[PDB]
Design a protein around this ligand. Structure first.
Ligand SMILES: CC[C@@H](CO)NC(=O)[C@@H]1C=C2c3cccc4[nH]cc(c34)C[C@H]2N(C)C1
Lengths: 214, 230, 256, 51, 338
């Protein structure tokens, strides 16, 4: 090798050192995908979110872990042509509005496609039901019969809310998949703890499968 | 892009001194550095080299054991510590930048230096010394002791021009390529051991001393130089 | 006895071939270059050495019947290889159980570089400790019989089997509780998998190490017929090890 | 909307077409002329291979 | 005129079909029957380039047949040296969701794009010894799928808003807009003369465009699913396409109809990329079954298999001198074959 050829190899090895260092720093992250219909409290899920149209990214830290959130809302195109990019995400967050009857039967359709996709066979889902207090006050005038024709029972607060949750959970058809459900309002502040507790359970379940027990 | 050198002065023999060079205007950490000195009535001479990242250091046989080269990347400064000075170290010291990859043009920018006063190699020959000569074609030749053509197909020959009261600048690198910001009237061609530099439509601001340099293997050696005068 | 010789012949061949296949499956595929698989490779090496260097030579011992014709070349190094390789097998099972235990109890921390560093350290102490036991009597003070000193019969036996046994029993006790706590098909499979792991370890080694400790401490006579079955039970454990940690993984089958 | 589609269809429906036999023949002749200059079809010796 | 104009469209569609039917006399297979088969093609891996820590989505060759650029989801652009397997530059990206990349014919610029709906142009040869962002092109309402360089000051892009565009880099404005597609545009291919280009969309059709006049001249419809890849013949009078229905087809500009189909009863997976040889005798395609196949362009006979990847092959490429072929896949590795 010539003198100039020896110097070129030295420059190439310094690039490898920086590339290796960047991979280590980026591996200590938790990737989450945010899904839901328009006007469902997607942008106010966590109060301590910081923004870092096309794709919108948002990150926050809890305890000693880094979280990254992706909101694919501005892509009004064929979803099947870019959904395989988010194949390595840890979990999926789905937001549902309990006080919007028109968006019903549309959120259910979107839930069915995501829960039954080839690239998301073994991905867990965290489900958020928003506007808990608005739904209770509104149910007095409309007894839930506008959205669901087939429903019976005294619908004050509980049975109506338990019926919607069972409708969403019926779309799961995988043994290695789980759904975590929670109900929140606009004044709740302990939303980061729920996500933290869910991801801890997901990693445990994955490690049992490697052991062979689950 | 700027390179300002500091230091110099009158030093008794046997003393010690250091020189500093401050860089401002480019990415300093990605460039290699060289020290080149010129005697008051002679040509150029190479001194030392430090690689990008301070992983490789080379010295000349004259100053080995008593010269030290170092760099400070965060402060963008280059140093040269010298001890046991002799009367043969009186020269003007320059600082040169260089980068090495596929298609690079090393020795592209020089900087004005500082004057210091104390009071197996390849031989490159330029037989011609003074050529009297506008609107004409001039050819200058350089010769080599051994062939500069490597097995990879590259010939390592460089050409420089130094105008009076100025610093040398790059004209031709690797015996065929024309440097940036240089008129197309300059051309260069040759074969193994024989090289030629031709100028067409000679004009003003083209008078000075021309140097041929090899970069095949360390240490780097220059030529005597050829002077063009009207 | 001819049928027994033929039956034991296939046992040696299977152990040599099956463990070799594990190495072939591992260092020919780019998806078996993860942290958990470095522990399996250490176990496989310690399993092929027994079938190649220990089982054949020991088989000749009962072929002649009572004599070891080789004087010192096959009566001083044969014992060293027998102790070194079998001890490493037992300590390779323990290192696997500890890695599984810390993955469930501490999922947040025991990942990435920390898991890699701890896993490699356990491999280092697996062979370092085994060599000390094997080389203890040879360097620090026709029948080819092992030392029967009362002091050596306790240090070499308690420190190679009884200590690892307590760790394995304790670790999988907590793991079974965690599986059932999170919760019917899945629960039934959890009990079966843990039972098979412990049962093979219990059956193949305890009968041998039980009589190796009681005999010197309390003067007792055991017929040579019983020690024949006891000896080969421990050797046969190196056949079941690749049958559990690799055959029932659903990922080694895909690469096969 | 409908008028735009008709205008586009009319422009594409008035062109000069040539027979498939000519198209196949003109496509086959190009391959024969450059057969000797295709390294992936006629491998070069190791001396002239840069890889 | 609400429904009367509908009848006119149907009549014109049947007029074109009759014109093409009367123009077909003999098939390509019959004409090429008495031609010696190429035989069997065997290729061996020569170089393997490592350094990407995620999936590779696109690559492009330089005009010198030595340099190439690769884009990955780790937000990095890498320029390699094929002969020495050396790294020249490493460009970090603001957005890590990239889907395409290109290399300028002069060799002074590179381009990239993705889910950010922006095309970025980088300057390679400049002072200060570093690569900086020179221009960001905005105006698309969907993700960019492909981009190609005409000159140092012009670029053509295809997006997910069913629209192609032509830009002026210095001005940063959209000079011409191409409209007419129904589904999302996925691929793009420039003619050798730099005067026409073809595109494939998700509506199972391909179109031929005019760069100077901005009009559509021909539409080809013979597929049954989304068209993912497209490539011109070296002559410039034909092109090939690849779709999700596990089938490749060849179309002729002058005859204006399909000429030959490539299919087999074993392949059921889609096609990600297609490419030609220097002479056009061989057609190279990449599939989702981890393999790359070689077809005889004239006899529709399978001639070889390239099997060196353990994930889906996403990108292809042939040098200008036709000496080597490069394949990239989702396993973060790319290889050079000869
Ligand atoms: C040489 C083979 C005959 C000797 O008659 N049998 C033994 O003594 C061998 C004695 C053994 C032994 C003792 C003490 C400590 C230990 N750690 C690991 C082993 C071990 C392995 C064991 N093997 C299976 C049999």
């Amino acid at each position: 090798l010539s003198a100039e050829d020896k110097a070129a190899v030295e420059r190439s090895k310094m690039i490898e050192k920086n590339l290796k260092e960047d991979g280590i720093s980026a591996a200590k992250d938790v990737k989450l995908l945010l899904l839901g219909a328009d006007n469902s409290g997607k942008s106010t899920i966590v109060k301590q979110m910081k923004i870092i149209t096309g794709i919108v990214e948002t990150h926050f830290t809890f305890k000693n872990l880094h979280f990254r959130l992706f909101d694919v809302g501005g892509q009004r195109s064929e979803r099947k042509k870019w959904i395989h990019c988010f194949e390595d995400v840890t979990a999926i967050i789905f937001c549902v509005d309990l006080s919007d009857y028109n968006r019903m039967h549309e959120s259910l359709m979107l839930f069915d496609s995501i829960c039954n996709n080839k690239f998301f066979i073994d991905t867990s889902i965290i489900l958020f039901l928003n506007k808990k207090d608005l739904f209770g006050e509104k149910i007095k005038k409309s007894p839930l019969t506008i959205c669901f024709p087939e429903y019976t029972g005294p619908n004050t607060y509980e049975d109506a809310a338990a019926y919607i949750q069972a409708q969403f959970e019926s779309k799961n058809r995988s043994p290695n998949k789980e759904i975590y459900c929670h109900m929140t309002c606009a004044t709740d502040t302990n939303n980061a703890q729920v996500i933290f507790d869910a991801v801890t359970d997901i990693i445990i379940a994955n490690n049992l499968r490697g052991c062979g027990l689950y | 892009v700027q390179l300002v050198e500091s230091g110099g002065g009158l030093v008794q023999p046997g003393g010690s001194r250091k020189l500093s060079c401050s860089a401002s205007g480019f990415a300093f950490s990605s460039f290699g550095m060289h020290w080149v000195r010129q005697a008051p009535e002679k040509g150029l001479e190479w001194v030392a080299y430090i690689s990008s990242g301070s992983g490789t250091i080379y010295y000349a046989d004259t100053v080995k054991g008593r010269f030290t080269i170092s760099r400070d990347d965060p402060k963008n400064t280059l140093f040269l510590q010298m001890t046991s000075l002799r009367s043969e170290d009186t020269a003007m010291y320059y600082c040169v930048r260089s980068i090495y990859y596929y298609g690079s043009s090393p020795f592209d920018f020089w900087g004005q230096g500082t004057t210091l006063t104390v009071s197996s190699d390849i031989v490159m020959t330029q037989a011609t010394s003074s050529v009297p000569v506008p609107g004409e074609s001039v050819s200058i030749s350089c010769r080599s002791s051994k062939s500069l053509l490597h097995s990879n197909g590259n010939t390592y020959l460089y050409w420089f021009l130094q105008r009076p009261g100025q610093s040398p600048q790059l004209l031709i690198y690797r015996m065929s390529n024309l440097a940036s910001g240089v008129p197309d009237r300059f051309s260069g061609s040759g074969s193994g051991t024989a090289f030629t530099l031709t100028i067409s439509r000679l004009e003003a601001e083209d008078v000075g001393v021309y140097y041929c340099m090899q970069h095949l293997e360390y240490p780097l050696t220059f030529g005597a130089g050829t002077k063009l005068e009207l | 006895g001819v049928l027994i010789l033929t039956l034991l012949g296939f046992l040696v061949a299977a152990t040599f071939a099956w463990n070799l296949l594990v190495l072939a499956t591992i260092l020919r595929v780019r998806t078996f270059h993860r942290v958990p698989h470095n522990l399996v490779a250490s176990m496989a090496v310690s399993d092929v050495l027994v079938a190649a260097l220990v089982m054949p030579l020991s088989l000749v011992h009962e072929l002649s019947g009572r004599r070891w014709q080789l004087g010192r070349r096959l009566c001083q190094l044969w014992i060293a290889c027998d102790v070194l390789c079998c001890t490493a097998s037992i300590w390779n099972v323990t290192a696997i159980a500890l890695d599984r235990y810390w993955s469930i109890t501490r999922p947040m921390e025991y990942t990435l570089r920390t898991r890699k560093c701890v896993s490699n350290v356990m491999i280092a102490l697996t062979w370092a400790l085994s060599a000390v036991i094997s080389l203890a009597p040879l360097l620090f003070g026709e029948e080819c019989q092992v030392s029967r000193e009362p002091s050596y019969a306790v240090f070499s036996t308690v420190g190679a089997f009884y200590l690892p046994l307590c760790v394995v029993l304790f670790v999988y006790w907590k793991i079974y509780k965690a599986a059932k706590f999170r919760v019917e098909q899945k629960e039934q499979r959890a009990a079966l998998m843990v039972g098979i792991l412990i049962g093979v370890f219990v059956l193949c080694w305890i009968p041998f190490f039980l009589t190796e400790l009681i005999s010197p401490l309390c003067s007792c006579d055991i017929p040579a017929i019983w020690k024949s079955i006891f000896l080969w039970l421990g050797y046969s454990n190196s056949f079941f090890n690749p049958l559990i940690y690799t055959a029932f993984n659903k990922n080694y089958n895909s690469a096969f | 909307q409908a008028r735009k589609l008709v205008e586009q269809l009319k422009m594409e429906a008035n062109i000069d077409r040539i027979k498939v036999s000519k198209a196949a023949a003109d496509l086959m002749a190009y391959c024969e002329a450059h057969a000797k200059e295709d390294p992936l079809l006629t491998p070069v010796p190791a001396s002239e291979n840069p890889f | 005129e609400l429904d009367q104009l509908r009848q006119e469209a149907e009549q014109l569609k049947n007029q074109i079909r009759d014109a093409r039917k009367a123009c077909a006399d003999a098939t390509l297979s019959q004409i090429t029957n008495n031609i010696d088969p190429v035989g069997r093609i065997q290729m061996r891996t020569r170089r393997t380039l490592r350094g990407h820590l995620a999936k590779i989505y696109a690559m492009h060759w330089g005009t010198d047949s030595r340099l190439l650029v690769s884009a990955s989801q780790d937000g990095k652009l890498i320029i390699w040296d094929s002969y020495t397997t050396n790294k020249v530059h490493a460009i970090p990206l603001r957005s890590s969701w990239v889907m395409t990349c290109a290399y300028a014919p002069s060799g002074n610029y590179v381009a990239c794009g993705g889910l950010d709906n922006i095309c970025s142009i980088y300057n390679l040869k400049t002072r200060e010894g570093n690569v900086r962002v020179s221009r960001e092109l905005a105006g698309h309402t969907g993700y960019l799928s492909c981009c190609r360089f005409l000159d140092d000051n012009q670029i053509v892009t295809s997006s997910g808003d069913t629209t192609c565009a032509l830009w002026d880099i210095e001005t940063g404005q959209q000079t011409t807009t191409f409209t007419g597609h129904t589904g999302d545009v996925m691929s793009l291919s420039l003619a050798p003369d730099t005067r026409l280009f073809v595109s494939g969309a998700c509506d199972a059709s391909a179109k031929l465009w005019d760069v100077r006049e901005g009009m559509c001249r021909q539409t080809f419809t013979g597929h049954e699913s989304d068209i993912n890849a497209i490539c011109f013949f070296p002559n410039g009078n034909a092109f090939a396409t690849g779709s999700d229905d596990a089938t490749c087809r060849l179309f002729d500009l002058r005859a204006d109809q399909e000429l030959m189909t490539y299919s087999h009863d074993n392949i059921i997976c889609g096609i990600t990329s297609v490419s030609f040889s220097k002479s056009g005798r061989l057609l190279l395609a990449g599939y989702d079954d981890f393999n790359c196949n070689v077809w005889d362009a004239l006899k529709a006979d399978r001639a070889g298999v390239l099997a060196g990847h353990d994930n889906r092959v996403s990108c292809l490429g042939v040098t200008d001198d036709g000496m080597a072929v490069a394949t990239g896949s989702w396993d973060s590795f790319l290889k050079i074959w000869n």
